């Protein structure tokens, strides 16, 4: 509440608390962290990105988004923890410090702020945006089916009332197009990580196609390493693979898009658990989730700085 050291990372928070936290961190570490507004949500909420940088030009960067599906509360929670951890670990952990000395990290903690507020206000299990309009009484888009990556192919629904509605057209959702513009403008993203829950998967492209990416040996080996790393803290077991082979055909996804933009290190995380609590993960599992998931992200970041 009054500092990042006082903020309770072991509980779920509302939108206003997470936004206030962003200000606390920026005030506490003005030299390392910048808050960027890359857009406004459908219902006009600021869309915020935290930039961690040690200086430089337009340094190669890591993108990280969390909470694009609003009900996956473990992701926004992890996302606050990560932001603190970046400030803690800089100059303490030789490895994280070599990363920030050369690369920037862009972290979007609440990708889908309207959906998030709605999970607090009215429906805990809401996952879509809150865009209206058309020939429908149904609200919102699945923002992870809205990307220009096999948009409107099988693996996404053309029904507005669907939980997997893709939207009217690729990048209809302002929460998506804001990211698109942001990353295309920057032009120097090397990794792109989207954070989801649940089922304990690490996934690389594609969802939308059975085509093998050209980088599949490397991405596979990276995913293997990062899952090994993650499991080392608490024994938490992930599976890894391409989206389409591991789950099922899915179109308009984040990672397919970023990989098609030439961002090679494009991974999605589905965090704990495997279905005991599902989206309603106990607050007592926040910090352990955040701590292990860090070891997996770190591993990918290392690989990135290195290739
Ligand atoms: Zn999700």
Please say whether the beta carbons of 56 and 189 come within 8 A.
no
Distance 69 CA to ligand 1 centre (A): 5
Distance 128 CA to ligand 1 centre (A): 10
For the chain, the domain total comes to 1
Is 259 assigned to a binding site?
A: no
Paired with 61 in beta bridges are 104, 189
Q: What is the CATH number of the domain that holds 74?
A: 3.40.630.10
- Dist. CA 244–CA 297, nearest whole Å: 22
Burial label, 19 (beta-carbon count in 10 A; 0-12, 13-18, 19+)? middle
Report CA 45 to chain centroid distance, whole Å: 18
Please say whether the beta carbons of 155 and 208 come within 8 A.
yes
- Dist. CA 77–CA 109, nearest whole Å: 8
What's the resolution in A? 1.5
Q: Strands, DSSP E only, in 136-200? A: 189-197
Burial label, 96 (beta-carbon count in 10 A; 0-12, 13-18, 19+)? buried
Specify whether 218 is catalytic.
Answer: no
Is 71 assigned to a binding site?
A: yes
What are the φ and ψ backbone dihedral angles of 38, each rounded to 5 degrees?
Answer: -100, 0
Closest CA to 87 of 76, 98, 77, 96: 96
Is 254 assigned to a binding site?
A: no
Please say whether the beta carbons of 156 and 250 come within 8 A.
yes
Coarse DSSP helix, strand, coil percentages of the chain, rounded to the nearest 5 percent: 40, 15, 45
Is 292 assigned to a binding site?
A: no
Method: X-ray
SS3 44: coil
Q: What is the dihedral of CA 293, 298, 304, 307, to 10 degrees?
A: -120
Tokens 């929460």 sit on residue: 175
Domain extent, residue 282, equals 1-307
Catalytic residue among 175, 270, 292, 302: 270
Tokens 């599976």 sit on residue: 239
Distance 77 CA to ligand 1 centre (A): 14
Distance 55 CA to ligand 1 centre (A): 33
């Amino acid at each position: 509440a009054r500092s990042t050291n006082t903020f309770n990372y072991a509980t779920y928070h509302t939108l206003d608390e997470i936004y206030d936290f962003m200000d606390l961190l920026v005030a506490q570490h003005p030299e390392l962290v910048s808050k960027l507004q890359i857009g406004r949500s459908y219902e006009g909420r600021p869309i915020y990105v935290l930039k961690f940088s040690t200086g430089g030009s337009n340094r190669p960067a890591i993108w990280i988004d969390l909470g694009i599906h609003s009900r996956e509360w473990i992701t926004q929670a992890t996302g606050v923890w990560f932001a603190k951890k970046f400030t803690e670990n800089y100059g303490q952990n030789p490895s994280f410090t070599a990363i920030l000395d050369s690369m920037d990290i862009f972290l979007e903690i609440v990708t889908n702020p309207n959906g998030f507020a709605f999970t607090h206000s009215e429906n805990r299990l809401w996952r879509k945006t809150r865009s209206v309009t058309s020939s429908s009484l149904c609200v919102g888009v699945d923002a992870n089916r809205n990307w220009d990556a096999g948009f409107g192919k099988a693996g996404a629904s053309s029904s507005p009332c669907s939980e997997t509605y893709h939207g009217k057209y690729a990048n209809s959702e302002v929460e998506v197009k804001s990211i698109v513009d942001f990353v295309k403008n920057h032009g120097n993203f090397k990794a792109f990580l989207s954070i989801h829950s649940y089922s304990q998967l690490l996934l690389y492209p594609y969802g939308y196609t059975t085509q093998s990416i050209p980088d599949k040996t490397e991405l596979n080996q990276v995913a293997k390493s990062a899952v090994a790393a993650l499991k080392s803290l608490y024994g938490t077991s992930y599976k890894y693979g391409s989206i389409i082979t591991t789950i099922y055909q899915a179109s308009g996804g984040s990672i397919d898009w970023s990989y098609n933009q030439g961002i090679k290190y494009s991974f999605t995380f589905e965090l704990r658990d495997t279905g005991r609590y599902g989206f309603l993960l106990p607050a007592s599992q926040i910090i352990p989730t955040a701590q292990e998931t860090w070891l997996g992200v770190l591993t990918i970041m290392e690989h990135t700085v290195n290739n």
